[PDB]
Design a protein around this ligand. Structure first.
Ligand SMILES: [Cl-]
Ligand SMILES: [Cl-]
Ligand SMILES: [Cl-]
Ligand SMILES: [Cl-]
Lengths: 206, 206, 206, 206
């Protein structure tokens, strides 16, 4: 079976910790959000969807394949499909974080354009990874597509053709980001959650 | 006397902890709110109304009957009647939480409709209990009925005939939720408090 | 010299703790606010005005008389006069807390009427002391009177003739409350700070 | 080499702590902001720009000269130039703090005038250092000048000719303050961040 058990357990502890941190920020209320971490080139560790991310225990962490399918046999879910999609788009990514903050939810409902943009040299330093011809951090907003494979399709199309790879928003579902490490993903989450705060606060005088 | 003393003491510790958690969220300011836990099919443990939920001690926890009456003889109160009402409506419920957050209070005053609604698949996972023909989490708002038995009446009528059983709001009094366990009730409280946040924030641009 | 030293030291520790609690709430930013505690019928312990209430040490606590004068000889200050005023109005009061929250400051500037009112049975339980013919918690707002003795005069007149004795606001200076114990004062502060939150939030849609 | 190593290490620990405090306030999200401390009349310790101020370790602290140049040879940066500028303007200053809060960022975008003002006797006590003919705490706003030496020029001109020396804002970059000690700088930061809160909240009803 190899040393998967070793890496899996490490990701379990990594995810439980990430969950306590997210919760302390008010970004994963009452079961919303989800967290995943790369176990190996064949398996991913992902938080069970109905569990509160702020009180995880080993039993709440599931092991799936790059097809979003649960190793112990099963059918993929929207969340499981969406994470694997991220892993496939960015081979360097080892962690995916989905938050569901009040600001993200609200922005998902009032933003008329299909993206949120800000331009913050200050915040760019959080994405030393991304090289682009712009200085504006951009966050694409995807529709609440009930058709999962199509939603995935649009996300792939966007990121395959876009220089910016900060994260994305799915209206009525929440924010998604990722990183080469859980630390990098959390940092990205914070950066984006910050933008959502400014974006709205602006639209409280506009 | 049986092992009531055993269960009572466990609920005391459960309630004091729930109170510290609620307070840390700013949901039980200066004595507002109240917490109750099922001791047995004949008794309920409830927080004394004039005590700060964030600094409870065993002496602040009262023992009442399913009639809202204080075991040591006494006359029921509005709060005591309202909780027992919840216990009677839902036999599976073992804990009731009443919060009084700034958002809930405000919503109690500005919402024109008699309910708050949102629709959040994400948040629905917090109510694995409820099965309905809708995807919108709904929260009924009841009037500041001075006539307690009538208020109770309306709450009973609503929930006896409604598929949704998330919680309810009493204008000028606060939010009410419940769960099969204190943990489940707290999680529900968070989910609903989240909706109140988005609801208002929306109405800051509408 | 008696056992003043005993009581003084107890109030020192009481005040330092009250200060850490206030600061954690964001109610005493950068030196604003002040805290006082009754040492005896002849002396009061009060926090030095230029010290940050969230990092007090014994050296930051001053001992004054019921005349606001610093025992070691000196001339009274506005703050010292205002607290002694409170102590004189309410003989049962042993602690006075002055906070300076963003909400209080803002309310001090936008409220057109000379008082803030709310009516919250829920919050009334925080003032088991006050008996009145009303159900609305009321907070009088006094002008930024440069003439200290006149400001004091108006405060005395108000409370000598008013049934409500929750606390008061001095525009451009901050909120004031008190209690038979520091715990009671802090609880009152929270109750009033809560009202300031709702009051404004309302005026974000009105 | 002298005892620089002694002082440097002390500033390292001072800066890491300041960073944890700033982060807990939500003022240095995802790498934004920066912190510096005077090591000697020839060297300054400054936080690396791309590191998260809330998770600093000795390796993230750089040593530069009063010319903003990195001792180990290198070319100055905007941040490094801006801090040294502050150190040169105020010889008593031993610490510089740059925050990047949601409020500061937002204010940087909506404030039409080139400064923010408030007038708060209460807050003035936080600046026992500054003597002026006014009672209003003033914060000058400088443009997002890509031309660094010119930005520096304007900042110097302002403070060389202004009685107020509370701090300043660079649109799209963040708030800057300083103090004779890190504690004094943090206190100033809080005072200014408070004003930004009130300023906006006002402009939510104006
Ligand atoms: Cl807003
Ligand atoms: Cl709002
Ligand atoms: Cl507001
Ligand atoms: Cl606002």
């Amino acid at each position: 079976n190899v040393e998967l058990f070793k890496k899996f357990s490490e990701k379990v502890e990594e995810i439980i910790e990430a969950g306590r941190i997210l919760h302390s920020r008010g970004w994963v209320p009452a079961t919303s959000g989800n967290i995943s971490a790369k176990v190996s080139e064949e398996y991913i560790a992902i938080t069970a969807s109905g569990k509160h991310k702020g009180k995880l225990t080993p039993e709440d962490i599931l092991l799936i394949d790059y097809e979003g399918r649960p190793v112990g046999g099963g059918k993929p879910s929207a969340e499981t499909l969406l994470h694997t999609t991220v892993y496939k788009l960015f081979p360097e990514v080892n962690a995916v974080v989905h938050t569901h903050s009040p600001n993200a939810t609200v922005i998902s409902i009032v933003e008329k354009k299909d993206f949120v943009e800000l331009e913050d040299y200050e915040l760019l330093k959080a994405f030393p990874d991304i090289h682009t011809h712009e200085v504006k951090i951009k966050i694409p907003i995807f529709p609440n597509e009930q058709n999962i494979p199509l939603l995935a399709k649009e996300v792939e199309n966007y990121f395959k053709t876009s220089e910016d790879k900060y994260g994305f928003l799915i209206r009525g579902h929440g924010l998604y980001t990722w990183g080469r490490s859980m630390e990098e993903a959390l940092i990205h989450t914070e950066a984006l959650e910050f933008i959502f705060e400014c974006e709205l606060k602006l639209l409280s005088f506009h």
